[PDB]
């Protein structure tokens, strides 16, 4: 916080997804890489936006510390962020719950769905006994 500055380059705004995307780099001389939460509050401060619609990712620290470059995408509204954004970035900010079922379990369950023909009760009940 004492000596940490943010700069933005390759900035361009596209209304196609109603967002403004840019490449951001943070200059932290003596600290570690700055956390994403601090980056979002600084970027929202610079662009006069709320620090809950911002997304930052892809942060790589250069060798020897100092600068760290990532990609920052901001939006003109939160609703558009729901419309077009990767679900993992949404879940990072807590705006999207995640499925908690194993892919292997889903394949076994679906294979048991294929085994049962027609009958809805047994089709949805095939995953009950062999848990």
């Amino acid at each position: 916080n004492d000596t940490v500055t943010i700069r933005t380059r390759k900035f361009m705004t596209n209304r196609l997804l109603q967002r403004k995307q840019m490449v951001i780099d943070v200059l932290h001389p003596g600290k570690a890489t700055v956390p994403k939460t601090e980056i979002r509050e600084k970027l929202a401060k610079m662009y006069k936006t709320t620090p809950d619609v911002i997304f930052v990712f892809g942060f790589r620290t250069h060798f020897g510390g100092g600068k760290t470059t990532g990609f920052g995408m901001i939006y003109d509204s939160l609703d558009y962020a729901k419309k077009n954004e990767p679900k993992h970035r949404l879940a990072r900010h807590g705006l999207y719950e995640k499925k908690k079922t194993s892919r292997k379990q889903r394949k076994e369950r679906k294979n048991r769905m294929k085994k049962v023909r027609g009958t809805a009760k047994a089709n949805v009940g095939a995953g009950k006994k062999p848990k």
């Binding site: 001389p29 003596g30 250069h62 060798f63 020897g64 510390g65 100092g66």
Partner: protein
């Protein structure tokens, strides 16, 4: 299938015969003078020199004012004067063949940081670079074989985080100071 690259090459060539007293003595002269780790390092820079000479030979056998010769000859000359192994007044393809291995080893970062007074010996230069105390421009380099360029020549200096530029002395210093103050009243 997979999106891997599989693009690699060897940077060195082993000598055709082993155990020649003349060759072994000459290579050990280069290792001792420029603080090289092993014989592979002098073989790799000999190999890069040989590749440059091979390209220069092929261009020389090519006809005069050939567009391919002029373009690639000027390109190769530009790289040589950029890394400082070839004099700027000596912009000739013939003069490339006169290059040796001594001036290629001269341009290494280990040699340079010794010859700019930042290191007491060539071995002190290598261990300092490996310990990450020397930076070029704004980026700190820990590679002894970093071939420096003429533009980057003037900008070699101690890194800020090292206990030779900015603050933050090393853990040996902090531990020794702690024991000194803790060992008395």
């Amino acid at each position: 299938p997979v999106a891997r690259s599989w693009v690699c090459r060897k940077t060195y060539v082993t000598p055709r015969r082993p155990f020649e007293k003349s060759r072994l003595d000459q290579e050990l002269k280069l290792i001792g003078e420029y603080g090289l780790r092993n014989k592979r390092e002098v073989w790799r820079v000999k190999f890069t020199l040989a590749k440059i000479r091979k390209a220069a030979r092929e261009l020389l056998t090519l006809d005069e004012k050939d567009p391919r010769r002029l373009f690639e000859g000027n390109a190769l000359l530009r790289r040589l004067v950029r890394i400082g192994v070839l004099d700027e007044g000596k912009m000739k393809l013939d003069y490339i063949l006169g290059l040796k291995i001594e001036d290629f080893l001269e341009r290494r970062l280990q040699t340079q940081v010794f010859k700019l007074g930042l290191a007491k010996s060539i071995h002190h230069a290598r261990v300092l670079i490996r310990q990450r105390h020397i930076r070029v421009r704004k980026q700190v380099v820990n590679i002894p074989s970093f071939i420096v360029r003429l533009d980057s020549q003037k900008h070699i200096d101690f890194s800020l985080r090292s206990p030779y530029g900015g603050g933050r002395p090393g853990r040996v210093k902090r531990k020794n100071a702690k024991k000194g103050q803790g060992g008395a009243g």
